[PDB]
Ligand binder design. Sequence first.
Ligand SMILES: CC(C)(C)n1nc(-c2ccc(Cl)cc2Cl)c(C(=O)c2ccc(S(C)(=O)=O)cc2Cl)c1O
Ligand SMILES: CC(C)(C)n1nc(-c2ccc(Cl)cc2Cl)c(C(=O)c2ccc(S(C)(=O)=O)cc2Cl)c1O
Ligand SMILES: [Fe+2]
Ligand SMILES: [Fe+2]
Lengths: 371, 371
Amino acid sequence: KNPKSDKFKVKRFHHIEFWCGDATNVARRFSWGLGMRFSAKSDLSTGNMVHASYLLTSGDLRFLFTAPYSPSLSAGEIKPTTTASIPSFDHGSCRSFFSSHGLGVRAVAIEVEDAESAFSISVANGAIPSSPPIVLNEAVTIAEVKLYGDVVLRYVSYKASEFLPGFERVEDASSFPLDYGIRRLDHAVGNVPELGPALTYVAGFTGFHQFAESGLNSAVLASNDEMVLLPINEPVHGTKSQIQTYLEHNEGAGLQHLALMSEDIFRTLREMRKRSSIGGFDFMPSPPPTYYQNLKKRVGDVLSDDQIKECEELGILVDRDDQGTLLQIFTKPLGDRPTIFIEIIQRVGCYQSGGCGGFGKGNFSELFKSI
Amino acid sequence: KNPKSDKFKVKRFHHIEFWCGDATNVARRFSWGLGMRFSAKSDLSTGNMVHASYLLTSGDLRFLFTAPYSPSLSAGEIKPTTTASIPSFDHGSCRSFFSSHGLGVRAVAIEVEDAESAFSISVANGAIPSSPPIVLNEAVTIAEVKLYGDVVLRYVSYKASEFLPGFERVEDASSFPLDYGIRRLDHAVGNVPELGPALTYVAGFTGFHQFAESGLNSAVLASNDEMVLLPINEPVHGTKSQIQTYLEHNEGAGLQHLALMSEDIFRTLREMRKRSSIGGFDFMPSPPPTYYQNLKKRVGDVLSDDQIKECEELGILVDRDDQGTLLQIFTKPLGDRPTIFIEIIQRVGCYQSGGCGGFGKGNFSELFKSI
Ligand SMILES: CC(C)(C)n1nc(-c2ccc(Cl)cc2Cl)c(C(=O)c2ccc(S(C)(=O)=O)cc2Cl)c1O
Ligand SMILES: CC(C)(C)n1nc(-c2ccc(Cl)cc2Cl)c(C(=O)c2ccc(S(C)(=O)=O)cc2Cl)c1O
Ligand SMILES: [Fe+2]
Ligand SMILES: [Fe+2]
């Protein structure tokens, strides 16, 4: 069942903010690799003396890339006089986050009905406050609470093309319209040392209900309509687990993978694979000959032999459950450390029902099986 | 005149090493933007638990991109037991360099006859030692001395496709052969607060001879054959200077620009300009209508009206001196801060004579003039 126990009104995923060393180069790599458009900016050219922030958009998915300038530039500023466009930004936290964890997701942003209320309620139910609700230009309100490790859950809300006050639109010869068909964030997954408490903490302050060898135990938390999915993994050892390997290279808990829905996974993967070796993203090694042999018996009704074989061409993995089918594939790590990666997905069956077709639990032993 | 006063035998530029936050994304941006090939690597996959280093090559130009992993990975190592492939690497210095200056050049590497001797001699003539000569796998010897700010002059020497011991070749489906025609480093320029002492210091320890409004005073230091060019600028104020603007955003002295020679500047600029908005590098605003009108009188004999107008198409600036002509164009800053940039050049007239045609001093008042 889905209890619908949300403690405050949640709408949709709103954006993912990466904390980087140099925002410019990462966005520009991400843009070309993922087919994402340069749509907004906040930096020196827009009067921001604190941080450089660049927004990539594709359909409704928004990726934000941020880095700190020399503190010397804003040394005359105080919070009340700040030129930062994201009031929660902190030079030390960012440099500290980036030193300890490397390129990674700092904030999972969700749009809510009233972020002020979202923050209060959440903190009343045990959330660790990170940034208090700030009202920007009397139009947008943001707040932040701790999610897991140094990742924050960011609440955004609008009085109601615009990202945020202070961000300028790139509407231009500077924003080419790349688009490899990716459209929205499906899920955002965290790696933590202990699942239970992570779950109890997060479920405790949001009201998100459990949508709930491998080397992992996982659980999925979700909003009332199940359109915000926030899964969490923990490792398991002795008889290494790949979640532990993440925790060691990441220096503790963080965001593991960003599942990005595509309106056509075949075109998305043609386009992304054309660019792997030329500035884009590499993909995990393709499953076997045989794995494409066993899909013939199990996805039949979903997929004609033609649509199948072309999964074999693009290294797409398939899985299924009573509610539907799902097409997925995984990138290699996005940066230097073997930590955060990206998943490209498309769900068949089920607006459509959030979480349609599972998350590929099936694929594990059915890749395996083909070797 | 050129005195030929080198204190030790110098051969050619050998490589430029950038210190980055995340080496992976910068190399991958640089590769696509500049038409440079992924040729070698040293990282976790090659057994390097200390740093991730990725080599871009184009003709003879080598760009190296390096970043630190979590120190936790090599906590059991001591210098004698290190898995670093570049023995001079230091986790703190790198993170400290990167925090203070942001994306930038850490090392200007020159190949010498004997780096051990190069280091001793230089330190005997007043160089500030940075890293002592280390012999790698009984084949290559590197040493480092301070150049200016936190930039080091790196001496490399071979017992004699290989970069260095410990670097693996990417010879593969992983190293696509991009090539927009860039072939070698022409010059490497530093911005410092005071020109005199910088010059006296550097000229003092190398023996490099002086090959020697704007808002700057500059001087060019050069090797015996004048194939290694190491120019230095200082600012001038009151009656801001753009060198001062660099010094403020960079947090002091550093490397200003990398002049990259192309075997065909028109093809290099077609290819680079195709990619500006799609993961590549942006170029400074093109000079006027009129500037292309005045080239008609002054480059005539060098360039037919056809070859000229196509400078106007690509925003290429031209300049000249008795020894020859030179074609040049400048990128916008390569990273977040308005600091380091790249120059694309091609020299006509003058093997060819190092420094043929000047550095574009002429272009300054002749851009100006066209506005
Ligand atoms: C339940 C949840 C939402 C957290 N979830 N669980 C997985 C998942 C499944 C299996 C393994 Cl090993 C690891 C993960 Cl993270 C998961 C995956 O997106 C997933 C599915 C399959 C595989 S693969 C390529 O077959 O082995 C890898 C991953 Cl990472 C996911 O979302
Ligand atoms: C002598 C030396 C080797 C250091 N050198 N000097 C310049 C130079 C010339 C003029 C100004 Cl303003 C600044 C620099 Cl750095 C220089 C340039 O490569 C150069 C030439 C022209 C212009 S522009 C586009 O006309 O104004 C800008 C630059 Cl950055 C250069 O190498
Ligand atoms: Fe997933
Ligand atoms: Fe130059």
